[PDB]
Design a protein around this ligand. Structure first.
Ligand SMILES: [Zn+2]
Ligand SMILES: [Zn+2]
Lengths: 57, 120, 730, 57, 69, 65, 281, 192, 108
RNA sequence: AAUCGAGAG
DNA sequence: CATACGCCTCTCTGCTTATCGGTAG
DNA sequence: CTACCGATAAGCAGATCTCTCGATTGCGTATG
């Protein structure tokens, strides 16, 4: 049995607040910079299909 | 022209021709000596080596055909100081030989040992 | 080596000065020898530099690049030879120009490297790099290609052609294309610098050698004069050339026109007759694999290429697969280093000539025969070729000047990651089809052709985007890196029954043309060609005849009904793929190649041999895999996607990368504190000696559904075992 | 991951008192599901298990 | 890199057995199974632990940062 | 020299131009400056046939079997 | 089938549909052999279908070109293609020679930049004279009307023209020239009936053509593969029916049953302006 | 994953019909007389023409594939479930195949009985220009095993030629899935 | 039959040359040969000329070191075969009316 | 911050 | 020899555009 | 006669999920 190098200490990430991009004032990109996770176009479209409007907003 | 290190040999020897005699071309490799000594794909044994005798009689396969070739029989005239062509009439065209042969070195791959190679 | 041939073929860069049909006071700079000193340090007498150096201190393991540039004035008047350094060129490990070339494991342990360390990687800026081995077209082989993209070149541009590469003896290649036009003429095509030019083929044919036009007729239409397709096409070609170039009556005139056309693109000096620059373009563009003095050769080669193009048009042959292994070779990585160094030194010569031209424009000092003037001019230019090459290795991008027949630009050096020993070994066997095909849509390049039997491991290929594009080599795949002794091969092929190239009026698919290294030798029939091929292998595998090298593969293609174009194609060059195999008559280790084997009956194991069918038997069926594919236990009892997943996983295994981790400074390394040998190991776990880097442990696995915490793909470890050191690592 | 592409994240450190045991008195240190085998069709894993037990014994 | 104190699966100490195993294997023509039998290891969980230890600490020690080489 | 639609020079082996474009009884070699009468080239009879795959049909296939 | 078909229907709305077909119900009071006869009567036949080999004899001594075309067995090709000697004669006399003549003259314009008898009959000679008068640089013509096995037509040009292939042009003209074609139809195969309801399906769509033929086809029930064709010849609603049927059909090869409401919503959203609209910019 | 003696006997016989199966498929496709020896020059010529022509190659592959699929179906029906030494519900592999927990009857059948014909795209296997399917197989060979039809099973392992064919098919599957992942993205985003 | 060679000849007495298919020469023209010395191989260089033709020629560079070409005749009534030695030369006939067609060395 | 390279589902 | 300032090549849809003639003022 | 226009094959503009790491960044010449 081989122990792979994709350990869970290198994969988890959480942000409450933190740095923001200066020209958009949106959360930064990346884990090592303590940024956010992107809810993309497809996720937005999924949120529209449910009808959960305030979730989308 | 005239090349450095080359001599124009002005003394050659005659090449006679006149039921009548016929001329052939024979090609040999450089590993057979020619000092010591009608058919298709013959063979002969010399220098304990397998010798192949292929007669690649091109053009002349279809009887006489047009008889156009890519080589000439260069002959001495009655001066023996240059190279000239010869024929049988006033055709002023090259006269290819009546046959041609080629010799090729031959080996013999030993027949494979099926019994000793098909080990279960 | 190759770096003397490269500077030899670079030539000389001529320039005249601006004060006196007196052209000026000539200058001709060049290089005749390039010296690569082994890496040393200036801390007097230069001590030896060891690769643990520049790795401990986060630097580069670069040697010194010094070249003997000349400064000749006018044809041996006052030649001012002078060597001068050009900055520290990065050099790899375990190569001759490195201080571990011929050492022992004991002293290797002493030198703080590793116990059985291997190189292949250049240490640039404290990071190990690696020149990936790309896979390119077979050199010196005219392969008929059908591409609808050849139709895009304009109207009357049929989508047929004949593409051939040709590599210079310094390992640099110039490719050629022979497009076929619907009107009837065929236009030779080539590229120079970073631009493309097209030329009618007959002008090239008469430029190469001075002979009659009837010779072209016989060299394309050999003995099929009773045919009509070829005769009509050739008449179109010849009459079109005559009516489009009415005043090119002889070779001198055609070369004169070629030189006039190609004068400023090549930056020819004013002391360049048109008859001279035409010859220079001719000898440095067309069929470069034949080199100079072989114009009489390139003539017959181009005639054969035209005839094969006609056969491709007429449906007498088949469009050879360019993405099948039968028509591929691999550039060796160090040869990319050689090509880029040669282009850099060429550009350095161009830059010093530019500096002299700036001197003419402003400074106006013409003392060419003054070494003080030479010192003044030379010290102005950028000489750090070593810095340029270090940039190249560290960034992967290629700022070249002529492309060197490479389809891509970026992505040539990858990082030799030392996450795991399996990853490390994996790097030095992978083959990349090129960054060109990564951006694409057609799957047919990603297929698994049967031509790659025992060359590219069918299992080892990373799933995802690079699937089929990054296929590793079989662990018993040898890549020839030396030219073979072919100079005596014609000497024996003639006596075997081959009429040589000259005085041979015969062409077409009906006869077998014998070609070595892309050079035509003679023409023989098909049955006799088969006999000759088998006789050659018979004499070759037994090493009695010194003139038949082991690596010489003899590709023989029998006559076929509209199959592949025939011709006994021999090869002895570099860059090829080779595989050992047995030869059933008088068994002995025989070396085969991808082009060669597609007509050989190679039984997988000796038990499935048949009467007069098979002639070769593989040593072991396990040799078609890579190392990481032979390491998977009981592979024949798994689904192939699972084998591929295993090969991808073992390259991501957290285990011991090495034991010299004391004397390294890599950014991030994972090691397993306690590793175990596998009980269920392959036989090659000991041939390659992988006991030094245990990647895991022998775990008691229970195939049981008991906890519920492992259904889709999860698994459960023992808490106590985990607490007794199971799989621990830092 | 096994050497047959049977990758899988560790889902719980099962305490040895809760692990199954045999007559010999050993809790296996790795538990994997049998349902991973039908779709994946890796008999190599089964024969490796057999060979490993035989070789260690 | 070095022999573990306790067997993972069970807990039977196999760390006082590596030198004994090597001595039993080299002094006599003892097979690995016989040596593991004579060493107090009868279950395969213990047997594989000493049958399959690499002892990479030997290769590790040969790079001493406190000794002239 | 004479082959199908084209005639080569007998001396220098170069392609003689097309007789129709030149004055009668005189066709000139571009290289040898020689002269050939036009009455030795009476019929440039050349035969041609298609490639037997140029015309796929549902009826040739039945002929094949 | 698959995503290609799906995106063709919805993403592009291509009227140049890659594979168009039309389903033609046939009358219950017809026989299978008569059905095959009608299928071969409708299906397209090109000139090249009935030419074993065409021989060109380039003679320059003015630059004559005897083009002798060999025809297949009459008893075979007549009953394979439903083509007769008279119809082939008309085709050669009208379409083929004129296409070839236009090709020859265009190529020259761009260039600058068995036995027989000496006289078949007087009516044949008058046909030959008519041919020579009608065409520009033709000089002979004769087509065997008693066996349908050959047809020659001598041809010449001037002396300023260069060499011409007279083979590739003949072949391409021959392939283009049609003998008996229903426009926008290139075959009419007889598929084995599925779920009853015998159907004759073609390689093209031309509703006007079969509208005339009611003796065999149940013209009231022709349903075709195309969408633009059915839209402009039957209406927006027939087009929407065709859209729903095609979109469900591709989902129906893999049995991925999607609701008949999503598909109809897609169809009516992409026909919301009275035309076949796609989903793109 | 095992069978019984009688099951193995049935499997072996119905499998060893495949020699004549493949030869007859080839002979019928080439429209030559049935039961003709494979070394027939006319058969070889027709097979070469079929190899050169794409549509002819497709027709031959479809016919031979149908025949060998018939043989595979016969083997599977006669063996599973009537041959396994361990039977449902004891046979846990067969139990999870029947119950839909994981896998399928096809998976069980190719583990225990026969792996079956390998489908490259809609064809059997690409053939090299010399007519060989692999280095070992003779050119233009009339044989199911040459034409990608593997007679092995994952229980008793697969021979190297069949291993190569199976690797080809598995890689093709992986590439097709990689393309199909992104093929629908643009369609769905444009619709939505 | 199985016919041997009666007499073997070594001195240059004949030659074989390949101009191109369908080539002729008149009675006037003659060919002059040369033989190289100090070189192991027996190279030949052919010289021929007339008012406007030059039957120039040079022998092989990579063939004569490996194979040979030999001329001879056979007796129709007897078994005697004469033998002669001939070297193969490749002749590239270039006329005298175009050798000097040259333009400017450099076009201004 | 972009480019290149390695990978994950 | 440091420091400082700018010049340089293998997809598919759908709308840019055709050469020419038909034909009523 | 010719303009109005109605229709005939080619050039170009714009297409073809989320994530975590690491490495590196074009040069030539002018003044002090
Ligand atoms: Zn234990
Ligand atoms: Zn001439």
């Amino acid at each position: 049995y081989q122990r792979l190098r994709h350990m869970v200490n290198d994969k988890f990430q959480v942000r409450s607040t933190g740095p923001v991009n200066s020209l958009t004032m949106q959360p930064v990109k990346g884990r090592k910079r303590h940024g956010g996770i992107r809810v993309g176009e497809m996720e937005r479209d999924a949120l529209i299909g449910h009808g959960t409007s305030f979730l989308l907003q | 022209s005239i090349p450095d290190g080359f001599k124009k040999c002005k003394h050659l020897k005659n090449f006679p021709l006149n039921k009548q005699q016929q001329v052939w071309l024979i090609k040999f490799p450089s590993n057979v000596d020619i000092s010591k000594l009608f058919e298709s794909s013959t063979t002969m044994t010399i220098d304990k080596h397998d010798y192949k005798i292929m007669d690649d009689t091109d053009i002349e396969s279809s009887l006489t055909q047009d008889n156009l070739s890519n080589m000439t029989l260069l002959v001495p005239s009655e001066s023996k100081e240059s190279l000239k062509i010869a024929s049988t009439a006033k055709d002023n065209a090259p006269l290819q030989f009546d046959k041609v042969f080629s010799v090729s070195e031959t080996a013999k791959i030993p027949a494979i040992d099926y019994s000793k190679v098909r080990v279960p | 080596g190759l770096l003397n041939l490269g500077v030899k073929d670079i030539g000389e860069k001529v320039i005249f000065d601006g004060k006196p049909g007196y052209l000026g006071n000539k200058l001709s700079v060049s290089v005749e020898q390039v010296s690569i000193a082994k890496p040393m340090s200036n801390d007097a007498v230069e001590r030896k530099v060891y690769p643990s150096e520049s790795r401990q201190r986060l630097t580069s393991y670069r040697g010194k690049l010094l070249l003997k540039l000349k400064w000749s004035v006018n044809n041996g008047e006052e030649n001012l030879f002078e060597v001068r350094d050009c900055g520290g060129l990065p050099v790899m490990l375990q190569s001759n120009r490195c201080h571990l070339n011929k050492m022992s494991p004991y002293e290797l342990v002493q030198h703080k490297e590793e116990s059985d360390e291997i190189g292949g990687y250049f240490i640039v800026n404290g990071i190990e790099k690696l020149i990936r081995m790309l896979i390119v077209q077979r050199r010196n082989h005219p392969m008929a290609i059908i591409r609808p993209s050849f139709a895009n070149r304009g109207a009357s541009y049929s989508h047929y052609g004949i593409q051939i590469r040709s590599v210079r003896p310094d390992q640099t290649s110039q490719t050629n294309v022979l497009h076929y036009l619907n009107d009837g003429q065929v236009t030779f095509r080539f590229s120079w610098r970073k631009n493309e030019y097209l030329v009618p083929v007959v002008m090239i044919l008469k430029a190469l050698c001075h002979t009659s036009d009837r010779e072209i007729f016989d060299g394309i239409i050999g003995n099929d004069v009773k045919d009509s397709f070829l005769t009509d096409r050739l008449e179109l070609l010849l009459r079109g050339f005559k009516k489009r170039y009415p005043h090119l009556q002889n070779r001198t005139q055609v070369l004169q026109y070629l030189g006039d056309k190609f004068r400023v693109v090549f930056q020819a000096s004013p002391d360049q007759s048109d008859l001279e620059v035409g010859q220079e373009v001719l000898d440095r563009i067309v069929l470069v694999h034949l080199g100079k003095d072989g114009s009489q050769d390139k003539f017959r080669m181009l005639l054969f290429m035209i005839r094969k193009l006609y056969s491709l048009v007429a449906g007498e042959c088949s469009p050879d697969n360019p993405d099948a292994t039968q028509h591929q070779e691999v550039l060796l990585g160090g040869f990319l280093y050689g090509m880029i160094l040669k282009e850099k030194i060429d550009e350095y010569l161009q830059n010093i000539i530019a500096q002299v031209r700036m001197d003419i424009n402003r400074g106006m000092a013409i003392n060419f025969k003054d070494k003080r003037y030479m010192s003044r001019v030379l010290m102005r230019v950028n000489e750090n070729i070593g810095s340029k090459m270090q940039y190249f290795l560290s960034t992967g991008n290629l700022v070249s000047q002529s492309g060197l027949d490479l389809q891509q630009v970026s992505g040539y050096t990858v990082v030799a990651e030392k996450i795991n020993f399996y990853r490390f070994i994996s790097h030095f066997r992978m083959v990349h089809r090129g960054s060109f095909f990564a951006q694409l849509k057609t799957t047919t390049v990603r297929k698994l052709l049967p031509e790659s039997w025992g060359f590219l491991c069918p299992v080892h290929t990373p799933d995802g985007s690079p699937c089929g594009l990054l296929n590793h080599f079989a662990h018993k795949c040898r890549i020839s890196t030396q030219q073979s002794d072919v100079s005596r091969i014609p000497s024996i092929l003639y006596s075997l029954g081959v009429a040589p190239a000259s005085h041979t009026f015969a062409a077409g698919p009906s006869l077998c043309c014998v070609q070595i290294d892309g050079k035509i030798i003679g023409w023989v029939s098909h049955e006799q060609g088969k006999i000759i091929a088998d006789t050659l292998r018979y004499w070759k595998v037994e090493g009695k005849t010194p003139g038949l090298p082991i690596d010489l593969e003899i590709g023989y293609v029998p006559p076929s009904t509209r199959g592949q174009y025939p011709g006994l194609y021999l090869f002895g060059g570099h860059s090829r793929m080779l595989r050992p195999v047995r030869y059933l008559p008088l068994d002995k280790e025989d070396i085969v190649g991808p082009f060669e084997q597609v007509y050989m009956n190679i039984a997988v194991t000796p038990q499935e041999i048949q009467n007069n069918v098979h002639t070769h038997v593989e040593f072991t069926p396990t040799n078609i895999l890579s190392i990481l594919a032979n390491l998977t236990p009981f592979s024949d009892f798994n689904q192939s996607p699972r084998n591929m997943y295993q090969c991808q996983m073992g390259k991501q295994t957290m285990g011991t990368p090495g034991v010299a981790l004391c004397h390294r400074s890599d950014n991030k390394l994972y090691r397993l504190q306690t590793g175990q040998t596998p009980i269920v190991k392959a036989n090659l776990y000991d041939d390659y000696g992988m006991d030094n880097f245990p990647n895991g442990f022998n775990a008691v696995v229970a195939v049981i559904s008991y906890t519920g915490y492992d259904m889709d793909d999860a698994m459960i470890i023992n808490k106590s075992a985990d607490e007794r050191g199971f799989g621990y690592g830092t | 991951s096994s050497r047959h592409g049977q990758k899988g994240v560790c889902s719980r450190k099962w305490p040895t008192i809760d692990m199954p045991f045999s007559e010999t008195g050993i809790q296996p240190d790795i538990i994997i599901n049998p349902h991973a085998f039908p779709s994946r069709m890796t008999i190599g894993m089964f024969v490796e298990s057999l060979a490993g037990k035989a070789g260690a014994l | 890199m070095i022999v573990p104190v306790r067997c993972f699966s069970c807990g039977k100490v196999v760390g006082d057995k590596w030198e004994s195993y090597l001595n039993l294997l080299q002094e006599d023509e003892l097979d690995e199974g016989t040596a593991l039998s004579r060493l107090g290891l009868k279950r395969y969980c213990c047997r594989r632990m000493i049958l399959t230890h690499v002892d990479l600490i030997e290769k590790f020690l040969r790079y001493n940062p406190l000794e002239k080489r | 020299s004479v082959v199908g639609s084209l005639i080569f020079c007998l001396d220098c082996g170069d392609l003689l131009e097309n007789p129709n474009a030149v004055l009668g009884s005189n066709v000139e070699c571009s290289q040898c400056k020689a002269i050939y009468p036009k009455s030795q080239f009476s019929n440039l009879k050349v035969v041609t046939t298609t490639a037997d795959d140029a015309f796929p049909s549902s009826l040739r296939a039945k002929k094949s079997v | 089938l698959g995503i290609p078909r799906l995106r063709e229907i919805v993403m592009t709305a291509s009227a140049a549909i890659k594979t168009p077909q039309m389903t033609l119900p046939i009358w219950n009071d017809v026989s299978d052999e008569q059905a095959d006869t009608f299928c071969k009567s409708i299906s397209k036949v090109l000139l090249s279908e009935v030419i074993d080999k065409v021989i060109v004899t380039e003679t320059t001594g003015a630059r004559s070109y005897v083009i002798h075309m060999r025809f297949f067995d009459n008893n075979e090709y007549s009953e394979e293609y439903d083509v007769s000697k008279e119809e082939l004669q008309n085709v050669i006399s009208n379409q083929f020679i004129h296409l070839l003549e236009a090709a020859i003259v265009k190529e020259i314009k761009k260039q600058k930049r068995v036995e027989a008898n000496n006289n078949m009959n007087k009516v044949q000679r008058d046909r030959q004279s008519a041919i020579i008068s009608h065409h520009r640089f033709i000089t002979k013509y004769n087509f065997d009307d008693e066996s349908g096995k050959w047809c020659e037509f001598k041809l010449e040009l001037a002396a300023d023209t260069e060499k011409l292939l007279m083979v590739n042009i003949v072949e391409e003209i021959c392939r283009k020239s049609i003998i008996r074609q229903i426009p926008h139809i290139d075959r009419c195969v007889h598929p084995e009936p599925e779920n009853g309801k015998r159907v004759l399906v073609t390689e093209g769509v031309n509703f006007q053509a079969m509208w005339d033929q009611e003796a065999f086809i149940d013209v009231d029930g022709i349903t075709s593969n195309d969408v633009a064709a059915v839209l402009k010849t039957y209406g927006v609603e027939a087009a929407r029916n065709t859209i729903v049927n095609e979109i469900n059909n591709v989902f129906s090869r893999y049995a991925i049953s999607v609701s008949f409401r999503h598909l109809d919503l897609i169809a009516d959203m992409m026909t919301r302006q009275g035309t076949y609209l796609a989903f793109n910019r | 994953l095992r069978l019984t003696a009688e099951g193995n006997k049935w499997r072996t016989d119905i499998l060893k019909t495949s020699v004549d199966t493949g030869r007859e498929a080839a002979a019928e496709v080439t429209n030559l007389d049935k039961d003709t020896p494979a070394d027939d020059p006319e058969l070889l010529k027709r097979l070469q023409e079929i190899l050169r022509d794409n549509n002819k190659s497709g027709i031959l592959d479809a016919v031979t594939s149908s025949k060998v699929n018939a043989i595979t179906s016969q083997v599977v029906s006669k063996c599973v479930p009537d041959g396994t030494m361990k039977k449902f519900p004891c046979n846990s592999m067969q139990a999870m195949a029947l119950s839909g927990a994981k896998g399928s009857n096809v998976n069980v059948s190719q583990i225990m009985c026969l792996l079956g014909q390998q489908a490259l795209e809609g064809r059997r296997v690409p053939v090299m220009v010399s007519g060989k399917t692999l280095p070992s197989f003779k050119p233009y060979e009339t044989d199911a095993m040459a034409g990608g039809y593997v007679k092995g099973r994952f229980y008793s392992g697969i021979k190297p030629q069949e291993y190569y064919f199976h690797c080809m098919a598995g890689r093709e599957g992986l590439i097709d899935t990689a393309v199909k992942t992104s093929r629908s993205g643009y369609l769905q985003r444009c619709l939505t | 039959s199985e016919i041997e060679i009666e007499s073997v000849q070594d001195q240059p007495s004949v030659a074989v040359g390949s101009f191109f298919k369908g080539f002729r020469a008149p009675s006037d023209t003659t060919f002059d040969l040369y033989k190289k010395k100090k070189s192991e191989k027996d190279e030949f260089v052919l010289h021929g000329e007339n008012e406007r033709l030059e039957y120039e020629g040079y022998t092989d560079s990579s063939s004569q070191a490996s194979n040979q070409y030999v001329v001879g005749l056979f007796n129709p009534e007897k078994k005697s075969i004469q033998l002669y030695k001939a070297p193969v030369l490749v002749s590239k006939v270039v006329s005298k009316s175009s050798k000097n067609l040259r333009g400017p060395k450099i076009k201004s």
